[PDB]
């Protein structure tokens, strides 16, 4: 803890990397290179539906979504809830980041969000997987 060589030679900070690096980004075609944006809002347009089986910690069954973002790369999602949207090819409002217990996926759906409304079997949630005009 000696200060001579401290202006001769400095120190570092910690070492951390931020969250969702292949997110918060809008891929170019005119100038071909991405934008570092951290946008509030964004879209999702669909390529498949997707589902993998081996689930230990829950040990029930539920699928997810394989939705591609701009212009030739693998981007993957998951539908956290009791609502099955047996759909695809949508145009939505993204939710950024991952919910607990799925590795590598960081992209999601807001309730409603211009494509569908949601799993309409919900009426008590009034704020989960599709819930609009709910008597409070």
């Amino acid at each position: 803890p000696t200060i001579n060589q401290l202006v001769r030679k400095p120190r570092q900070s910690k070492i951390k990397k931020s969250d969702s690096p292949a997110l918060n980004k809008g891929f170019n075609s005119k100038k071909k290179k991405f934008t570092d944006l951290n946008s509030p809002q964004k879209r999702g347009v669909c390529t498949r539906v997707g589902t993998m089986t081996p689930k230990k910690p829950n040990s029930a069954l539920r699928k997810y979504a394989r939705v591609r973002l701009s212009n030739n790369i693998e981007i993957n999602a998951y539908i956290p809830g009791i609502g099955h949207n047996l759909q695809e090819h949508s145009v939505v409002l993204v939710r950024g980041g991952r919910v607990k217990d799925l590795p590598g996926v960081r992209y999601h759906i807001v309730r409603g969000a211009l494509d569908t409304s949601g799993v309409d079997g919900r009426r008590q949630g009034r704020s989960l997987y599709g819930t609009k005009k709910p008597k409070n």
């Binding site: 200060i3 001579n4 401290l6 202006v7």
Partner: protein, 80 residues
């Protein structure tokens, strides 16, 4: 508003008064606080005189009357 008594020492020289004087000062950095002493180089000139092998002098900030050189003052300590 007058002109200072900037001083220093000498290092080397070339043909027909490529003269100089050394510049230095007491001061420190804003970050990690040590009394490390520091310098930068200047540009004075003579006929051929204020030059290498001992020219502890003064210098000025005036009209240079010079190429890119800047000083007219020599106010000495001694010679070798």
């Amino acid at each position: 508003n007058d002109r200072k008594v900037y001083v220093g020492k000498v290092v080397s020289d070339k043909m027909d008064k490529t003269i100089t004087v050394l510049v230095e000062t007491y001061k420190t950095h804003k970050l990690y606080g040590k009394r490390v002493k520091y310098s930068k180089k200047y540009k004075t000139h003579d006929e051929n005189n204020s030059a290498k092998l001992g020219d502890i002098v003064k210098i000025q900030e005036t009209r240079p009357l010079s190429a890119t050189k800047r000083f007219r003052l020599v106010e000495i300590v001694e010679e070798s």
